[PDB]
A and B are shown apart, each in its own frame.
Chain A
Amino acid sequence: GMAYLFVRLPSSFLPDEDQGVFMTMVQLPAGATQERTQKVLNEVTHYYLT
């Protein structure tokens, strides 16, 4: 049961610590201007706040 557990124990890396931040990435269409992104980052800020 050692190697039977070890092959199904997935050889991963270091765990995702709750490091007190998390990075939110936005990605608009190809050639979308900075007015739209701030407008989407109006929503995502309003989403993560309210």
Chain B
Amino acid sequence: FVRARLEEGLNPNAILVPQQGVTRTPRGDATVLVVGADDKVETRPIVASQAIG
């Protein structure tokens, strides 16, 4: 049964942070640790969707 790579339509604004920095703080809430223009880090939470690669 042949695997079908089934292509769909080109997520047009895709915030692809690498997995190396995204951690879960608190339970179930992913927090990228984005530093602003201040050179002060800010732990803004995200919602971590489909891990691609």
Number of interface residues of B (CB under 8 A): 2
Tell me whether A29 is interfacial, beta carbon within 8 Å.
Answer: yes
Q: How far is the CB of A38 from chain B (nearest CB, A)?
A: 14
Instruction: Give the total number of A-B pairs whose CB atoms are below 8 A apart.
Output: 5
Say whether B11 faces chain A, with CB atoms less than 8 Å apart.
no
Rounded to whole angstroms, the CA-CA distance of A36 and B23 in the bound complex is 16
Answer whether residue B20 sits at the interface, using C-beta atoms and an 8 A cutoff: yes
CA distance A29 to B20 in the complex (A): 9
Which chain A residues have a beta carbon within 8 Å of chain B's beta carbons?
Answer: 29-32, 36
- Give 5 pairs: A residue, B residue, CB < 8 Å, sorted on A: A29-B23, A30-B23, A31-B23, A32-B20, A36-B20
